[PDB]
Amino acid sequence: MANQISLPRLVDLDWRVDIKTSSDSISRMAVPTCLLQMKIQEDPSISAVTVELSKETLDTMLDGLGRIRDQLSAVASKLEHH
Template identity: 60%
Template sequence: MKNDYSSLDILLKLSSKQQMVNVCQQAFLYRKRGPDHLPEAFIKDISQTLGLSARETRQCVCTLGHLLKTAVFNGSTDPKDIFVIFPAGFHKNLRDLITKIIIDNMDMWKEDSVAVQVSLPKLVDFDWRVDTKTSSDSVARMSVPTCILNLQIQPKAPRIDKTPQAETVNVELSKETLDTMLDGLGKIRDQLASVANR
């Protein structure tokens, strides 16, 4: 089903480019949540500017969100590729402005789209070091090397408008565990290399 983006011509009534950027940001942020989840204060402000009812404004913003989502899904930052999304006869200046906003925000919106997918926590950064643990028993005093991994992990966001803080997880690996892990990673590397060479 193709959306009727020609209804977006009403956005020409917005008073400034910054207001258009704000509308696009909100439309993309709430693109999956439906018209009833848009913030009331935002809808009231835009409704007054556009001269529309709250329901019509919500529908307009959702249509814009669908257009933005389609552009990000296509992933091109070439204006010609984005122009194809708009219907024939769409207002040229408005099309150019929306296209510029899409190009300016493409990287951030792609990252946001990936971040809200159902997935495991994201590895943000890591550090490692080798420590020597000293242990003693009745026979002799021994030094045992261990590898300490410091992982910074960002969990999935609990809400669409919140970015969770990275959490730190420390893992201690003995020499045997590290050897097993490296052997497993080596086998994965070899399997991927054999698939890539086919």
């Protein structure tokens, strides 16, 4: 059919930046970290997924989502050319 049913929807994205004790240092060295909360909905019935993100993990997420954006745009371009 058309798009009437669909996989869960990401409907909220929030975050917090904490300072914590690092694990890469023998001494008392503080390092930042992200707490990320995504709220996901099914078409009501909202769930929350909370993860802890480092800088490198965030950069990798950003690269991946950029590649997804590029693939979506290329498919849209091929679709507009019937």
